RNA sequence: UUUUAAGAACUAGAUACUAACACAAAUAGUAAAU
């Protein structure tokens, strides 16, 4: 049974112009609200999430790994050694 | 009669009826104002009205704010109407489904046919002797509405159906499945750590075959207890659903039965959980799980299922004891919750904690018991009941990362008959990541 | 010498799957009998017949 | 109506003695203790509502209302009280949050949960409703003891 | 189901259990494992009696042979000096039907009995007190205590059950006859009504190895922990190794006797003594693999210092050879 | 009146047989294929 409180992503903006929900893997991508920036901020999309909060940090440390390695630790491989590098 | 009986299962028919109509329960559940809507009042549907064709009844009763003008009944796309013939408040939809064929692929004659006959018949249950019919041929995907009309609906229906017939997943379940049978498909990473809750289901430990003596002489197959292994990569509370071989008692081949009981467990777990603890995705390496999962995941269009794009090493879960110690002791199947990371959230983020973790699983996959000794070589520092991996200091974790890392590289170069010295970085990172 | 073990072993069995299967079944019956007996014998050593 | 008496007695605390979980004679008492402890958890959540998922509070209370009434009247079947009490007992132990979740998993699967530190059940609709909210009490507790 | 027990002798209790400072008898109970190069007996010393029906079973005592304990099909259990002494210590009574098997507490204070009355009792060896009674519909066959603590009971109804029910073992098909432990704690071998052996790790349901190729009513384990000895109905003894490869070996076999029974090995593994229905003990030279001696004593089941062995059988007398 | 097993320990794998167990995922005892 489905929780009636929280809308299915594809009903969020009805018009077939809105944004594409590919029902196989159930993932909106662009956001459903492309017209009115909602007075109160409103699903802002899936892509709006991916960068946020806990993955950027990873991106940075990995940059520091590539460039350090030409400047030999490896992010995925040996983590903590590098990690405390990026700390220092 | 075979190929069909595939094409519909787990009552995929009934589910279709829910997905469609119930999803309208939303769309026009929330449209109050502009059409003058008091409230959305539908009758709780007996489970059989979907697939029973004898006779039908009023589905979803629209009870107006004030009053409504019922014109003479026309189709959805039958246009020009004078509404004031009557007035009502309560209403309903008749929304129906039929798999058409090269004689009757014209609905409308069926729409008004059934609609009219029903409406003017006794047995047909109606709170208002006015309403709307919306039919569909699943075969050729057509649809229609022959209703009475008070104003404003027409395009709400029209556009709304554009959405439905292009969205409400159950349909997309067919159009997947029909293509399975037909074998027509038109030719021509770190985000795991984002906020929303991501889960790992991996089923290779679910049904464990065990070879035993054949009365005369042959090789006997059997199985011994499994369990379903799921975790989020982040917060480290393991969901193990115990699989107690009683489950498999009498029936079938247990390949299909495995996949379907895995699905039904994962679903039941999900449902039972709160909106706050539910996932926004699911990630599995075994793709044999797609259909069972999905088909039991119709019920939650909110969640979105996503497979692996990439080579992955999850089959070693059991070789790390304490959990397996738990697997072998269970008298009756039940959930158990655990801790993945020992305590890795202090001295690290879960990030390189997971990199080290995968690498551990790896050196447990290739050479195995060498790795187990590496771990427990010095037991003289002891693992609590709560931890799993041997507890260490920085250095121990660190170097052991190096060594476990080393195995697959060396054993690799030797065993797979392609050299370790001629390697390029990106293939190293490849096998390491996958 | 291993193929000669093979053939040399092969010639010396005349029956076919069925007969051999019988030999087994029958012996199993004999063991069942003897067991059931010494059941009754030890029950007699308790006196209860 | 002794259930009308136990509910008015101020001599009963929220503390659960695990040795009483499977007791037949102590059923009425343990049932009231579970009622009292759940109210106490909802009370602390209330006191810090703004800090912990305020949007889920009301729904949790509503789902737990029927359970609480039953606990107050000693209407829960033996096996069900046993499982719930086990979860709440471990929850009262900070370093046993994992044993509480494990017990919760059994209960949600329809199996009897017995104290772990120290067979089967049937689940209904409205019953499934309060079993779900219990998980919310667990997540709140973990957050509460962690943020002070 | 009521209870009535009796005490034998006025000797009573520094304050010691009867079982406890055997000390006195020539030699030493604490004693090293190999007394010397072993000997076979000709002279029988004690009748013992008491039982009007053949003893179901005979055992000795945890640690060293200080006491001896017998099972009567008259629903009775008696303790004995085991030194040829006349006195039988304290009688036990409390079963409805003939007592099928027993086992002792490794420490030596508790005692377990299983009978055809569908009950199993835990006893205080120092008072005769029925401490605890264990239920279940099925008649319980051979029961062991864990060498360190759970009961392990083999049932006629396939299963083996660990009791504090802790762990059921359903894999076996047909009745279960006997249970030993090949290596203490870690593993045991169950031999079953179906002509197979099931080896398991401890407290884990699945069985590590399955061996089948007539029957195995009695199985015993060498004092070295290296061999197993089964008295197959087929009139033979089969030798097995408790060490890792559980493969029966051609080199050692015994077929000088015809037949449930006990097979035992003289400490130092010098001899094997089988007790048989005809009533003649068969002594074999384990090393040279040959019937070295034979007796027609008894008019026989379990056969258990290098100076002697103790036998019992359906005439109801315990004899010492 | 019967009766002699050359005895014990160590070790490895090599040829075999087998197993509805494992490589968009599915086959069985009237018929089989360029
Ligand atoms: Mg045929």
Curated annotation (Swiss-Prot), chain A:
Subcellular location: Nucleus
Protein name per UniProt: Pre-mRNA-splicing factor SLU7
Parent-protein start and end of this portion: 246 to 342 of 382
Subunit structure, as described in the record: Belongs to the CWC complex (or CEF1-associated complex), a spliceosome sub-complex reminiscent of a late-stage spliceosome composed of the U2, U5 and U6 snRNAs and at least BUD13, BUD31, BRR2, CDC40, CEF1, CLF1, CUS1, CWC2, CWC15, CWC21, CWC22, CWC23, CWC24, CWC25, CWC27, ECM2, HSH155, IST3, ISY1, LEA1, MSL1, NTC20, PRP8, PRP9, PRP11, PRP19, PRP21, PRP22, PRP45, PRP46, SLU7, SMB1, SMD1, SMD2, SMD3, SMX2, SMX3, SNT309, SNU114, SPP2, SYF1, SYF2, RSE1 and YJU2. Interacts with BRR2, ECM2, PRP18 and PRP22.
Domains as described in the record: The CCHC-type zinc finger probably plays a role in the ability of SLU7 to bypass the requirement for PRP18.
Extra information: Present with 1490 molecules/cell in log phase SD medium.
Record-stated family: Belongs to the SLU7 family.
Post-translational modification: N-glycosylated.
Function: Essential protein involved in the second catalytic step of pre-mRNA splicing. Involved in the selection of 3'-type splice sites; this selection could be done via a 3'-splice site-binding factor, PRP16.
From Swiss-Prot, chain B:
Effect of residue 203 to N: Reduced growth at 30 degrees Celsius. Strongly reduced growth at 16 degrees Celsius
UniProt effect for mutating residue 17 to S: No effect on viability
Effect recorded for residue 286 to K: Severely impaired growth. Reduced growth at 30 degrees Celsius. Strongly reduced growth at 16 degrees Celsius
Region annotation Restriction endonuclease homology domain: where it falls in the sequence: 12-183
Region called RNase H homology domain, residue ranges: 189-434
The record's note on its domains: The MPN (JAB/Mov34) domain has structural similarity with deubiquitinating enzymes, but lacks the residues that would bind the catalytic metal ion. Contains a region with structural similarity to reverse transcriptase, presenting the classical thumb, fingers and palm architecture, but lacks enzyme activity, since the essential metal-binding residues are not conserved.
Purpose: Functions as a scaffold that mediates the ordered assembly of spliceosomal proteins and snRNAs. Required for association of BRR2 with the spliceosomal U5 snRNP, and the subsequent assembly of the U4/U6-U5 tri-snRNP complex. Functions as a scaffold that positions spliceosomal U2, U5 and U6 snRNAs at splice sites on pre-mRNA substrates, so that splicing can occur. Interacts with both the 5' and the 3' splice site, as well as the branch region. Has a role in branch site-3' splice site selection. Associates with the branch site-3' splice 3'-exon region. Also has a role in cell cycle.
Protein name: Pre-mRNA-splicing factor 8
Section of the entire sequence shown: 1642 to 2085 of 2413
From Swiss-Prot, chain C:
Top-level taxon of the source organism: Eukaryota
Localisation per UniProt entry: Cytoplasm; Nucleus
Note: Present with 784 molecules/cell in log phase SD medium.
Protein family: Belongs to the CEF1 family.
Subunit structure and binding partners: Belongs to the NTC complex (or PRP19-associated complex), composed of at least CEF1, CLF1, ISY1, NTC20, SNT309, SYF1, SYF2, and PRP19.
Physiological role: Involved in pre-mRNA splicing and cell cycle control. Required for the binding of the NTC complex (or PRP19-associated complex) components to the spliceosome to mediate conformational rearrangement or to stabilize the structure of the spliceosome after U4 snRNA dissociation, which leads to spliceosome maturation. Its absence leads to an arrest of the cell cycle, possibly due to the inefficient splicing of TUB1.
Name of protein: Pre-mRNA-splicing factor CEF1
Source organism of the structure: Saccharomyces cerevisiae (strain ATCC 204508 / S288c)
Lineage of the organism: Eukaryota, Fungi, Dikarya, Ascomycota, Saccharomycotina
Residues represented out of the complete protein: 149 to 197 of 590
Curated annotation (Swiss-Prot), chain D:
Source organism, top-level taxon: Eukaryota
Biological process terms in GO annotation: generation of catalytic spliceosome for second transesterification step; mRNA splicing, via spliceosome; nuclear mRNA surveillance
A cellular-component GO term for this protein: U4/U6 x U5 tri-snRNP complex
Subunit structure: Homodimer. Component of the U4/U6-U5 tri-snRNP complex composed of the U4, U6 and U5 snRNAs and at least PRP3, PRP4, PRP6, PRP8, PRP18, PRP31, PRP38, SNU13, SNU23, SNU66, SNU114, SPP381, SMB1, SMD1, SMD2, SMD3, SMX2, SMX3, LSM2, LSM3, LSM4, LSM5, LSM6, LSM7, LSM8, BRR2 and DIB1.
Name of the featured protein: Pre-mRNA-splicing factor 18
Major subcellular location class: nucleus
Subcellular location: Nucleus
Described purpose of this protein according to its UniProt entry: Component of the U4/U5/U6 snRNP, binding principally to the u5 snRNP. It is not absolutely required for the second step of pre-mRNA splicing at low temperatures but is required at higher temperatures. It may stabilize a particular conformation of the U5 snRNP or orient the U5 snRNP within the U4/U5/U6 snRNP or within the spliceosome.
Keywords: mRNA processing, mRNA splicing, Nucleus, Spliceosome
Family as reported in the entry's similarity comment: Belongs to the PRP18 family.
Disulfide bonds: none
Shown stretch of the complete protein: 80 to 247 of 251
């Amino acid at each position: 049974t489905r929780l009636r409180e929280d809308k299915a992503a594809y009903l969020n903006d009805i018009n077939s112009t809105e944004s594409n929900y590919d029902p196989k893997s159930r993932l909106y991508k662009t956001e459903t609200l492309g017209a009115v920036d909602e007075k109160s901020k409103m699903l802002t999309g899936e892509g709006l999430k991916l960068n946020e909060l806990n993955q950027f940090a990873r991106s940075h440390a990995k940059e520091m790994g590539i460039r350090d390695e030409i400047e030999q630790h490896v992010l995925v491989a040996n983590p903590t050694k590098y990690e405390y590098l990026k700390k220092k | 009669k075979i190929s069909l009986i595939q094409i519909f299962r787990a009552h995929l028919w009934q589910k279709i009826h829910e997905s469609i109509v119930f999803d309208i329960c939303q769309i026009l559940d929330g449209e109050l104002d502009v059409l003058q809507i008091e409230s959305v009042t539908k009758e709780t549907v007996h489970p059989r009205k979907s697939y029973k064709m004898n006779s039908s009844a009023a589905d979803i009763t629209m009870e107006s704010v004030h009053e409504w003008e019922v014109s003479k009944p026309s189709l959805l796309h039958e246009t020009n109407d004078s509404f004031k013939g009557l007035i009502t408040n309560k209403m309903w939809f008749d929304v129906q489904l039929r798999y058409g064929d090269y004689d009757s692929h014209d609905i409308s004659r069926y729409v008004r046919a059934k609609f009219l006959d029903y409406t003017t018949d006794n047995v047909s249950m109606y709170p208002s002797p006015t309403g709307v019919m919306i039919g569909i041929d699943l075969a050729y995907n057509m649809y229609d509405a022959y209703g009475n009309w008070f104003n404003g609906l027409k395009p709400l229906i029209q556009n709304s159906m554009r959405t439905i017939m292009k969205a409400n997943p159950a349909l997309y379940v067919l159009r997947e499945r029909i293509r399975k049978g037909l074998q027509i498909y038109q030719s021509s990473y770190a985000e795991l750590f984002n906020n929303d809750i991501k889960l790992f289901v991996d089923d290779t430990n679910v049904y464990r075959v065990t070879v035993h003596k054949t009365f005369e002489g042959n090789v006997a197959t059997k199985a011994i207890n499994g369990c379903i292994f799921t975790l989020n990569p982040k917060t480290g509370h393991l969901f193990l659903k115990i699989i107690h071989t009683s489950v498999w008692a009498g029936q079938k081949r247990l390949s299909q039965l495995a996949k379907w009981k895995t699905a039904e467990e994962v679903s039941a777990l999900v449902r039972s959980l709160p909106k706050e603890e539910q996932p926004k995705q699911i990630i599995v390496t075994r793709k044999a799980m797609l259909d069972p999962l999905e088909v039991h995941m119709l019920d939650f269009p909110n969640i979105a299922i996503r497979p692996t794009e990439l080579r992955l090493p999850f089959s070693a879960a059991m070789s790390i004891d304490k959990l397996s110690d738990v697997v072998m002791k269970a008298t009756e199947p039940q959930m158990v919750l655990f801790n993945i990371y020992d305590d890795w959230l202090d001295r690290i983020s879960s990030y390189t904690a997971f990199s080290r973790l995968t690498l551990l699983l790896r050196a447990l996959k290739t050479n195995e018991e060498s790795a187990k000794m590496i771990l427990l070589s010095d037991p003289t520092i002891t693992i609590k009941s709560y931890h799993l991996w041997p507890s260490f200091t920085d250095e121990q974790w660190i170097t052991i990362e190096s060594q476990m890392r080393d195995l697959i590289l060396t054993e690799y170069g030797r065993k797979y008959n392609v050299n370790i010295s001629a390697l390029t970085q990106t293939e190293i990172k490849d096998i390491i990541l996958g | 010498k291993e193929m000669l073990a093979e053939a040399r072993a092969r010639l010396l069995n005349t029956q076919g799957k069925k007969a051999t299967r019988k030999i087994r079944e029958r012996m199993l019956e004999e063991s069942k009998r003897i067991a059931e007996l010494q059941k009754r014998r030890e029950l007699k050593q308790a006196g209860i017949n | 109506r002794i259930q009308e008496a136990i509910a008015q007695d101020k001599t009963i605390s929220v503390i659960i003695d695990p040795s009483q979980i499977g007791s037949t004679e102590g059923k009425p008492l343990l049932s009231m203790k579970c009622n009292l402890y759940i109210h106490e958890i909802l009370s602390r959540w209330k006191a810090s509502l703004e800090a912990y998922h305020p949007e889920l509070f009301l729904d949790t209370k509503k789902a737990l209302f029927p359970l609480l009434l039953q606990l107050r009247r000693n209407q829960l079947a033996p096996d069900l009280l046993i499982s719930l009490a086990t979860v709440l007992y471990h929850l009262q132990q900070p370093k046993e949050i994992n044993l509480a979740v494990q017990s919760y998993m059994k209960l949600s699967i329809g199996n009897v949960a017995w104290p772990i530190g120290v067979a089967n059940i049937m689940i209904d609709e409205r019953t499934r409703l309060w079993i779900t909210s219990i998980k919310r009490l667990i997540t709140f507790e973990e957050w509460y003891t962690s943020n002070h | 189901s009521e209870q009535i027990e009796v005490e034998e002798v006025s000797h009573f209790y520094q304050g010691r259990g009867y079982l406890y400072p055997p000390n006195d008898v020539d030699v030493d109970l604490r004693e090293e494992r190999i007394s010397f190069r072993c000997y076979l007996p000709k002279k029988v010393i004690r009748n013992y009696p008491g039982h009007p029906e053949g003893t179901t079973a005979l055992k000795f005592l945890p640690k060293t042979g200080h006491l001896i304990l017998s099972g009567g099909n008259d629903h009775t259990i008696k303790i004995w000096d085991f030194y040829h002494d006349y006195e039988c210590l304290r009688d036990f009574q409390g079963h409805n039907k003939p007592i099928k098997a027993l086992r002792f507490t490794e420490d030596c204070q508790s005692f377990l009995s299983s009978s055809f009355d569908r009950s199993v009792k835990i006893w205080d060896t120092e008072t005769g007190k029925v401490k605890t009674r264990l239920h279940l519909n099925s008649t319980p066959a051979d029961v062991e205590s864990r060498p360190t603590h759970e009961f392990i009971v083999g049932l006629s109804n396939s299963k083996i059950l660990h009791y504090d029910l802790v762990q059921t073992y359903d894999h076996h098909l047909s009745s279960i006859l006997a249970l030993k432990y090949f290596p203490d704690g870690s593993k045991f071998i169950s031999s079953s009504e179906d002509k197979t052996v099931r080896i398991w790790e401890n407290q884990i349901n699945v069985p590590i190895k399955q061996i089948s190729d007539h029957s195995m009513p009695f199985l015993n384990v060498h004092p070295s922990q290296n061999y197993f000895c089964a008295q197959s109905m087929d009139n033979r003894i089969y030798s097995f190794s408790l060490k890792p490869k559980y493969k029966r070996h051609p080199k050692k076999i015994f077929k000088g006797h015809s037949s449930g029974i006990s097979l035992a090995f003289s400490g130092d593994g010098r001899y094997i003594c089988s007790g048989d229905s005809k009533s003649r003990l068969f002594t074999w030279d384990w090393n040279t693999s040959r019937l070295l001696n034979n007796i027609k004593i008894p008019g026989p089941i379990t056969q258990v210092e290098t100076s002697k062995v103790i036998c019992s059988g359906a005439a109801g007398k315990i004899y010492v050879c």
